[PDB]
Design a protein around this nucleic acid. Structure first.
Lengths: 50, 112, 50
RNA sequence: GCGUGUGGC
DNA sequence: TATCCGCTCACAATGCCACACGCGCTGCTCGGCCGTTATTCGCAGCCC
């Protein structure tokens, strides 16, 4: 059900969709979407799990 | 075309915005994509006191704007720098520049 | 067991990091244009805001 | 003028 | 195209009383003023 309710089924549109979910619009063409998605959780600068 | 796109930054620090943007463009050696940051915003008018002629020569509504060609990556570069309070222009995130009449008008203003 | 205690040292280190991230932004925007044989590493940082 | 901290009915 | 159904936002959180402290510096940016209006002293009505 979680997959069937997902309107996007590829990796590219998923990135821009999650960026639009995070940032107030301003969708990037594989430039800021992937970078922000990797910086918000997978970056040691803005993520400091002790 | 090397369009004259308009943007508004943090007021008061607008000279600091100009130099920060200039240094950022000069670091990424992207001179073939971007231009100036409206250095002509220096109206030499002043309050000329007696025996002390210290003149800052700064009088303009601000609005540091950069001559640039519209690109998504370039937009992300110019927003990654600080002082991006408002990227004005009627749009979602991709605006349009202003015609050459206002360019001639601001050139006249610089001439004065 | 799901509730962790943080004493004076942890909060002090957190505030020190909150200051240090700004100090790092400052020294990075200063070193972004600082070239060789210009200054000694004493004026790059700001002791008063930390 | 407010905010913050603390205490009491 | 109507009928509810689901997502989103405004709004509330006693009442009081007592004590204490705390409210940053520097680089752009904007407006704009006469020695005839405002300061100060000489003179006289009125109460003690």
């Amino acid at each position: 059900e979680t997959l069937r309710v997902d309107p996007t089924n590829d990796r590219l549109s998923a990135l821009v969709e999650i960026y639009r979910m995070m940032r107030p619009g301003e969708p990037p063409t594989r430039e800021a979407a992937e970078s922000l998605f990797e910086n918000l959780f997978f970056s040691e600068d803005r993520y400091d799990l002790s | 075309k090397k369009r004259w796109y308009v943007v508004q930054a943090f007021s008061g620090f607008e000279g600091r915005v100009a130099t920060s943007l200039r240094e950022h463009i000069k670091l990424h050696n992207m001179e073939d994509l971007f231009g100036e940051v409206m250095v002509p915003t220096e109206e030499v008018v002043e309050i000329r006191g007696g025996q002390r002629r210290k003149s800052e020569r700064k009088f303009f509504p601000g609005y540091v704007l950069v001559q640039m060609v519209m690109n998504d990556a370039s937009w992300h570069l110019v927003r990654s720098v600080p002082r991006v309070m408002g990227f004005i222009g009627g749009t979602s995130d991709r605006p349009a520049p202003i015609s050459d009449k206002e360019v001639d008008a601001i050139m006249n203003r610089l001439q004065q | 067991g799901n509730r962790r205690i943080r004493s004076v040292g942890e909060m002090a280190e957190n505030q020190f990091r909150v200051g240090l991230v700004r100090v790092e932004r400052a020294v990075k925007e200063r070193l972004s244009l600082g070239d060789l044989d210009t200054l000694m590493p004493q004026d790059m940082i700001n002791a008063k805001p930390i």
